[PDB]
């Protein structure tokens, strides 16, 4: 055992790495050209689905690769985030209701457990790619009416929908007013030919360009009352929701351990392959970021081997389980965030001038690195509250 | 009376700063589309040499706006780098001239001194726009130069030929010059950072042969000391965006965010006071030349790269809080934080010295070596 | 020309930084000694009235070296903190007063005016030193009572006031509780020799142990009817300058222990001959550049407060022009200081470990700023934010 | 399973963990005065031996307590780092030669192996105290020895003595030694309550009867002194509960600042204990499930543990100096704990192997060619 990221422990997370190891080459060559131009890699990803990829973290019994361990999980974006960051970007929103529908199949409502098989055994195969919009668009707040003859209308548009240009269906978050007063949280499914469903490709960013971060807007969206995911009442949420939370992207800390991985394998080769003997100055910044690298690694390792042996052992309480896991998530992406783009700052300041060149590999990683820090569950500004309300009383 | 690069001192400076305070307005706006594109302000730079601002750092009696002051200079340089880095680094290169041949046609041999009335008076009123063909290209050795910032707009290349060192000022209209526009770098896209690839014996300007004394560290320093105010200026930039967006949100402000903002202005007055001082170091070390040559020249270029070492990590330290200050919108091509972003990050590869060299020269200094 | 605490400039000050050359020497060497034992310098402290660095900071008229730059207050508190921190820490409780009465006895009421002269012109030889009893204890409130006959009785205690072995007058803060409602808020000039008053000699910290850091008790002190102050709560951001001008000085220490963990890490260094390791280059370059860094930020803060001191033509706003760029430096020097004197010591080796070695005091004396208000990181962090947003 | 010495792994540390549970309380409150005076606990000491801890790290079947698992031995030494850096710093020097002896036990030469039993045999129940004179003091290079030891941690409470003789030998030196005198001058800015004395050694007589380097002695190097990475996460998790439990005591609402300060030593902690975590879980596989060549096996263990104490020395110093400016001045009086552990937590960046220095030109040298 060595906990840092290195190899795969299940078996079935192993069937998974080197099945990956075949498009690996493929996907990392046409990673500076689909940065470049900002084009989702349609093809490239179709492949994934022909062996099977598109279909891990699903049950054996209702596709193939059992993948639930998510230090696994997090290790196979980290080998495919060294080849293109935002592939794997993309790859995780995939994987991601890999885990949620599982924990939802096995652990959810006859009514809402009956769906949940349809979509986990369709994207199985790669013939449905599931997406999730949570975030609302600036000034819009994603919502449920009735029109009267028991339909309901979605209207609402949601931003930051990452592998959306391949996706088939979508869990919109929206929230429907009760008659009562309350409002309720329900999150419905719907499918890509919807009616008032319309994709939008504005994804014009820093980094991460290749991944397909659209917004996508629903107009009067039409979906029975049979299909919803009504949950608790807004506002009053408890700490059991965390668990669910940290599962869903505590695994994106394994791609931003590999866009550093990556840039150190440049930035050391490229000073390695300079001969005779190195500069003072370089013998300093290659020991602090292999130093950096390896605490990196190490901490996301621990944090995610923490959220596996309280995802499936614990059955006390259901809020201690939520604390015990989103914390040292925290606590990993606290330090990746700086930690990260702290190694590809120096792998950048090792090659030199070249390095700043659009043409060089460690510019885009220098971009695409960036990225974490905004990524919620939580923000610097709102991981500080968290975490000082749990080391405190609050 | 400050030192944190506030506002000019020289009234001869002080004339260059209202003077450019009409043309930014002007800049800032296309600052955004000239960056996306990757174009040099052409038409925005030759209308300077319209109000006289291509031909300050030239002697009063030469062409206008005497302006001598390295601490002036750099203030200009950063309220012009608010509005857009790129032309700020471009203007630079011309502004660096008028000081390195002011103090050519001052304290220069007669053949070297008549020379340098032909050019300095030509740019004075922008007739004529120099370059510096410094850097060599990797694996060619002069005898095509990369990274040669303003060339597009260019009239004159000082190249760096050489076994003794020796720099002849060819001209644009050359029979075998050719300029490349095949920059494409991460930050700063809208300078003219172009590469380039016969003139007699009375036209060279030999130098000593090539190691080297530490004279002409004085020279070095004088030459891009001042591009520390345009990194300030970034800074200052990204600050402005992110507090105005922080405090336009109304009501109280998160835990983490005044942490955030109080640490980016605390970086951010060090960063200005420190190249301040550097500065400020230079211009009083400039005016004294009876003492020895070489103390004159380290008293100089050390203050320097002690600026120029903090602020190539706290200057990029206060965009990365104002971009985490923001959220994601600040990710957004779109968005003026995320050019900051990257403009920012250009100071650390620029000579002299490098991280990895700096650290040579000031531990020797702080040594015997 | 410099601006980084390199050299005074008015030629009143001038004359304070030789002076003190003649007292450097005899003070460096007892340094480890009185560190250890934790002794207040008495006659080492003495030597300085006879001189009339005692009574620097003080009018020409009145007694002496008419010193009222602040950047050159900081640049004597510089060459004397590479001497002894804890020496230099107290000398400015004496120097702090002196600007503040300055400021007092010109711009001042005709009732405080008049005993201004009384001591500013009484500690210009020597004969009286000025104390500040300030912070309260913990869970202790210093407030006057009235007895009846007209006379008030002065009760409480006051911590970290420094120079207090050798001090005569304590200017306490107290505040007494008016019949109307509301609590005015008043600063009494006692004297040592006061009836119940008392001086505990129970400072034993991590660093600036020679300081004369103790608590000072008040049981039952009277006191005729004293400087009276606005109430308490609403109080301007005009009080921000005063309390700027009196400690944004004590910057000038922190520099000094900072310059001076360098100079030993760095002749340490470069008396080991032949090549410096990889990885010594890195740090020696590094702290020189923080050290710069440091000197050159508390430096422009300073030769600031002094351009916004003198013109007194709103007073709210030269009051934040002055605590602003102070609390940046002392927010820079608070984390940059205590920075380049670690690298010191992880550039001499296990040696500067040794309570024996210079570096060992140092790296405990460096750590002393960032408790001294104002303002705390967490308070700073508050004003900063506030004042770079609304509120 | 975690990785962050949360808790010990190995059923054999399991029970050294709880053994200690009732020595902690004990030398906790004793703390704060043999640091103020710098005297050894000696009966403190003593008291491990009469439980076992004082043998722990040495084979079953040699007197009891089989703890060879390097993770649970620095799991072990954070516990009573919690308590007592000091102590743990000493209680290190005993454990140290535990598993260097076991090692050359098992895998060594005849002549050699059998004083192995000898001296693993005597400590395990506490009759002897073994020590390690490895470094030598400024000016002075060590049948018929000389020269002179520094920084000897548990001296004291010292029966034998490992000194580092060339001709590269390790002699044993028994306390009662003709020419041998132990002088207890250690003043230092922390850890003055351990053992760090400096003895001399002057013309000692010895049998021969009892008696460049290759990347494979890196192997040795790091099971020795590895498991001290444990202390230093021991003397930080120790100032954070102290630092956190005032700040939470405060009751209320808690100052921006202070929440800023608070969430980033609860990171850089986390971060710190499972680096070292992964360090030590690494340098037990390597220690074991390994037959392959003996060079590689050294720089897979030195390496990593190298990285973790390049961590550990700049990220707990960071943590105690924020739980230090958290509580404010009353935490820079003497009398205070946090003040102490100001001192104890610097210690770190002092030992060999490897110093800042050192290690700088360590791992730039893996990292590249050289």
Redesign the interface.
Known sequence: ????LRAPLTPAGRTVVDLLAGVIPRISAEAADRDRTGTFPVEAFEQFAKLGLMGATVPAELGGLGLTRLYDVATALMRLAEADASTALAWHVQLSRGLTLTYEWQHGTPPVRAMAERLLRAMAEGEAAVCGALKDA?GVVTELHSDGAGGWLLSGRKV?VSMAPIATHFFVHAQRRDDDGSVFLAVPVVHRDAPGLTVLDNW????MRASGTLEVVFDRCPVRADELLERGPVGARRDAVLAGQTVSSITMLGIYAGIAQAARDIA?GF??GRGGE??????????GL??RL??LR??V???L??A??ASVDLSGDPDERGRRMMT?FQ??K??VNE?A?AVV?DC???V???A????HPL?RL??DV??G??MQPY???????????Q????
């Open positions: 055992m060595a906990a840092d600036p930051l014009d960013g820093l980094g050391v000073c390695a190195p500069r003072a100055g370089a013998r300093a910044l290659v020991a292999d130093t390896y605490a190490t901490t390792g621990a944090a081997t923490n596996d042996a040292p606590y990993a606290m330090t930690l783009p700052d950048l300041s090792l030199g001038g070249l700043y060149t659009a043409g510019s220098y971009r960036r990225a820090g905004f923000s610097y500004v709102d991981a500080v509250d968290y975490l000082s309300g080391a405190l009383g609050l």
